Design a protein around this ligand. Structure first.
Ligand SMILES: O=C(O)C(=O)Nc1sc2c(c1C(=O)O)CCO[C@H]2COC1=NS(=O)(=O)c2ccccc21
Length: 297
């Protein structure tokens, strides 16, 4: 089992070598367009880029570049789009991307302020009277309402493509106590947030891929996605013992670099998956237990 590997990893204290090992094995593909001079100001961090092969392209003739990747998990049959926290000049591209990609949901795993710095643009309206219009890609965004919990908030947004006046509802799931380069408070509150996004319908295959981000779109987002995929995999066979977490993280880093930033986020992934396996394996009652534990209200 993964649970045996965990104990055994923990016992000999070797998470950091395990994680280093992954870092060494991880793929490396060109990110030439990310690196073009015209895109300098479309990238939040010098060091974090989309590979060319998996990057999301805007449907615009001017400049199709956005710091975003399609993580496409073939065996699990789920995709996500991982992106960085939008910059003040690319909140229009971010919303363009969700319109074009037909996502129903965006998962935000960070605060716009962390560790004294602005980690993300305020890319969505904070109240009903004051919608956002993104004039460059001709999109309108309105808070329809939000459901505030002690550790996360869900919002309902309306996205209008101003060019045809089509309209879509986007669910925003905002985790606000997961620290940059840290980990969720516990497996239960992580699993409860994840199942909130599952229950919501946004992950379902009748929609475009969910867009998940943190500040870089790699640490916290890779953690979130790795757990979800692992649970999905376990689900379809009902066979926990044919999931290899490290191996799934490595299929993931074929599509974007740097997925999962430290060895404890790695270790939290095992925690999250081992716990969630309870629910996957037929004990649904754990779900409401995660909710009690997580103290959502
Ligand atoms: O929001 C999060 O949860 C998150 O992940 N945030 C990140 S990942 C990250 C940073 C931050 C940040 O918010 O400060 C600073 C830039 O570097 C990467 C770390 O460095 C690198 N990440 S990488 O694997 O893309 C890579 C390649 C080469 C050199 C450095 C790097």
């Amino acid at each position: 089992e993964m649970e045996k590997e965990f104990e055994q990893i923990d016992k000999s204290g070797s998470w950091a070598a395990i994680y280093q090992d992954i870092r060494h094995e991880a793929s490396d593909f060109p990110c030439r367009v990310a690196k073009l001079p015209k895109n300098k100001n479309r990238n939040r961090y010098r060091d974090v880029s989309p590979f060319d092969h998996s990057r999301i392209k805007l449907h615009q003739e001017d400049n199709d570049y956005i710091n975003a990747s399609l993580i496409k998990m073939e065996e699990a049959q789920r995709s996500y789009i991982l992106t960085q926290g939008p910059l003040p000049n690319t909140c229009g591209h971010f919303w363009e991307m969700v319109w074009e990609q037909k996502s129903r949901g965006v998962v935000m795993l960070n605060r716009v302020m962390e560790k004294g710095s602005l980690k993300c643009a305020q890319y969505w309206p904070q109240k009903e009277e004051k919608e956002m219009i993104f004039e460059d890609t001709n999109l309108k965004l309105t808070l329809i309402s939000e459901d505030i919990k002690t550790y996360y908030t869900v919002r309902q947004l309306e996205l209008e493509n101003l060019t045809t006046q089509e309209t879509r509802e986007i669910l925003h799931f905002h985790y606000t106590t997961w620290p940059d380069f840290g980990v969720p408070e516990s497996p239960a509150s992580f699993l409860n947030f994840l199942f909130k996004v599952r229950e919501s319908g946004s992950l379902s295959p009748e929609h475009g891929p969910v867009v998940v981000h943190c500040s870089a779109g790699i640490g916290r987002s890779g953690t979130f996605c790795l757990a979800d995929t692992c649970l999905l995999l376990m689900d379809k066979r009902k066979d926990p013992s044919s999931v290899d977490i490290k191996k799934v993280l490595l299929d993931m880093r074929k599509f974007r670099m740097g997925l999962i930033q430290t060895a404890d986020q790695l270790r939290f992934s095992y925690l999250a998956v081992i716990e969630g396996a309870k629910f996957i394996m037929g004990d649904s009652s754990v779900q409401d237990q995660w909710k009690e534990l997580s103290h959502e209200d």
